From TrEMBL:
Keyword terms: Heme, Iron, Metal-binding, Monooxygenase, Oxidoreductase
Record-linked InterPro entries: Cyt_P450 (IPR001128), Cyt_P450_B (IPR002397), Cyt_P450_CS (IPR017972), Cyt_P450_sf (IPR036396)
Cofactor: heme
PROSITE patterns the record matches: CYTOCHROME_P450
Protein name as annotated: Cytochrome P450 142A3 Cyp142A3
MF (Gene Ontology): cholest-4-en-3-one 26-monooxygenase activity; heme binding; iron ion binding; steroid hydroxylase activity
Name of the gene this protein is made from: cyp142A3
PANTHER family: BIOTIN BIOSYNTHESIS CYTOCHROME P450, P450, PUTATIVE (EUROFUNG)-RELATED
Annotated organism of origin: Mycobacterium ulcerans (strain Agy99)
Source species taxonomy: Bacteria, Bacillati, Actinomycetota, Actinomycetes, Mycobacteriales
Recorded superkingdom: Bacteria
Family assignment from sequence similarity: Belongs to the cytochrome P450 family.
Amino acid sequence: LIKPDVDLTDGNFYASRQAREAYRWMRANQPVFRDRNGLAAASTYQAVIDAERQPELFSNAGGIRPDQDALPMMIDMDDPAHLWRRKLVNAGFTRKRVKDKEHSIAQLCDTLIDAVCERGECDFVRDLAAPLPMAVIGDMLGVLPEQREMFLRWSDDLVTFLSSQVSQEDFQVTIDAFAAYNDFTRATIAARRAEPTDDLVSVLVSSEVDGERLSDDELVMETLLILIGGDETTRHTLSGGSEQLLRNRVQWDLLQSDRELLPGAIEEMLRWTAPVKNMCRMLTADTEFHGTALSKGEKIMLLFESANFDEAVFTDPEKFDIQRNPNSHLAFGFGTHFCMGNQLARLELSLMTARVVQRLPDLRLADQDSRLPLRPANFVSGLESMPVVFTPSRPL
Ligand code: HEM
Ligand SMILES: CC(C)CCC[C@@H](C)[C@H]1CC[C@H]2[C@@H]3CCC4=CC(=O)CC[C@@]4(C)[C@H]3CC[C@@]12C
Ligand code: NA
Ligand code: NA
Ligand code: NA
Ligand code: NA
């Protein structure tokens, strides 16, 4: 095994399909790894957990992304300022409020499958995996159903070109996407100030943190955080997890034969796909961390996918096993910033996967001998496309 020569900010690393071999080297030889440019990364399950449990030393207030300033959103804040924001919107994502959405989310799943069932084929990414979480979080945000496609396109342009090697033409698209989203959302904020609604934008507009109204800048960025959290994450577990079911037919047959295996299947899909490849922390002081000296002010990447394949926690991690138990993956992170939408994501995954294995029972990849492309982006990433085939059925 040769040491990886990699740039962890280069989107191409996360699409090369040699990332997990690079992770394996890190976990065995330098758990807190420094890449070709010296960027520090926590590669082992233990190192990620230890960093998450010490927010006083591993801060979010420097921003969660490499080479990027902190923004006015709660994921870029430390406690208690971060907690004050979480409490404004936590109520919409509790176990009961999520479960009470099952009928509406199930209806969206069937509407989306109704749109492709007569075709006998679709792009599983474009036509099922991406639109379902978009519709769910769009409804909570007050996005009109006919404008979901517009918001998802903005969202895609905001994350799919995150890379130290981004081209000028892709960078311009990211800039233009934020400008359009910013203009639209500021108009939305003014509309909800005149006529409040029950969507999350109106909730944030009507909120106070420590007795102060949220700034218009923060309102735009908190709304965007909720949007991207909803529509650029679950989609990759839906597509990538379904792909592993199709590529490991024993697992697909197991789930089709026993529906009570669905909760465990969802957890293994989450472990395998790890849509959030990394979150950054900024060191507030010099420290020695798992054999690596870290300096105050530098950033360290928490490699969630690397932790999800750590042999110290998972037996035979390269085997897709929907019956894996326990399955304490870190797809949702850990600590005070643990994913607020973890329950909503799991229900999105459960309802769509159950309806896919029900209404597309003979689902297959259009070419089982192919290798599907992954998005070369350094933050969230998954399958770009996924052509599938099935026997047509009639809509419901
Ligand atoms: C498979 C689906 C998802 C994955 C893998 C995922 C992953 C993550 C991760 C890794 C974090 C940071 C945790 C840390 O740094 O320790 C996070 C935070 C967050 N996620 Fe999720 N997420 C998913 C779905 C969602 C959904 C559906 C929403 C809906 C709004 C959402 C909203 C958020 C928010 C607001 C935060 C910031 C929480 C905070 O800073 O306290 N996520 N997510
Ligand atoms: C997956 C979720 C839990 C976290 C979501 C983080 C999103 C909202 C964050 C992460 C990366 C950020 C972008 C970083 C680069 C860029 C510089 C600009 O010129 C303005 C907009 C911005 C485009 C940011 C807008 C939204 C950002 C995308
Ligand atoms: Na790779
Ligand atoms: Na800043
Ligand atoms: Na654009
Ligand atoms: Na197949």
